[PDB]
Amino acid sequence: GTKQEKTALNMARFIRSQTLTLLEKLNELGADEQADICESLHDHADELYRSCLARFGDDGEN
Amino acid sequence: GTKQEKTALNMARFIRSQTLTLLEKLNELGADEQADICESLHDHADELYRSCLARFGDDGEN
């Protein structure tokens, strides 16, 4: 239901946030290859968030 | 340092887990397009975990 929809949208938003924070940590670590993959992962997570936002977002959202 | 390395490895592992759980929720929701993107996102997060594991993993790990 909507309880599950909002939960999934929140998860997508959370994952997007976590990938951003990990990207920061990998750059601070000078973790080359890791950061490249994490940067691309973050873009991908943003693509999923935009998808979940459009479908599970309300009137003013989506 | 190693405190930051382990933190980043844990984050990668966590994100991998979160994407798996989100994938489950999206499938339960019948969220077609979302699940396809999340499945691909999970594979991507696994690629990042394997990368962080090799670099930040100890002797028995990595």
In chain A, where are the structural domains located? Answer: 1-62
Name which of B10, B16, B22 to mutate to probe chain A: the one with the most chain A Cβ atoms within 10 A of its Cβ. B22
Interface residue ranges in chain B relative to chain A, Cβ cutoff 8 Å: 4-5, 7-8, 11-12, 14-15, 18-19, 21-22, 25-26, 28-29, 31, 33-34, 37-38, 40-41, 44-45, 47-48, 51-52, 55
Residue A29's alpha-carbon distances to A2, A23, A34, A36, B57, in angstroms, are 40, 10, 10, 13, 14
- Are B8 and A22 in contact, with CB atoms under 8 Å apart? yes
Whether B41 and A40 lie within 8 Å, measured CB to CB: no
* Distance from C-alpha of B45 to C-alpha of B19, rounded to nearest angstrom: 8
Helix and strand counts by DSSP (H, E) for chain A: 2, 0
Which technique was used to obtain these atomic coordinates? X-ray
CA distances from residue A24 to A18, A19, A34, A59, B21 in whole angstroms, order as listed: 10, 9, 11, 33, 24
Closest CA to A15 of B14, B9, B46: B14
**Secondary structure letter of residue A29 according to DSSP:** T
Place of tokens 């890791």: A34
To which residue do tokens 């499945």 refer? B39
Q: Which of B37, B39, B43 to mutate to test the interface with A (most CBs of A within 10 A)?
A: B37
DSSP code for A60: S
**Under 8 Å CB-to-CB from B28, ≥6 apart: which residues?**
A4
Helices A32-56 & B32-56, crossing angle to 10 degrees? Answer: 160
- Helix, strand and coil in chain B, % to nearest 5: 85, 0, 15
Task: With CB atoms and an 8 Å threshold, state whether B48 touches A37.
Answer: yes
Q: The domain A1-62 is classified under which CATH number: 3.40.50.2300, 1.10.287.230, 3.40.630.30, 3.40.50.12160?
A: 1.10.287.230
List all residues 6 or more positions away from A49 whose beta carbon is below 8 Å from its beta carbon: A12, A13, A15, A16
DSSP secondary structure string for all residues of A39-54 = HHHHHHHHHHHHHHHH
Helices (H) and strands (E) in chain B, counts: 2, 0
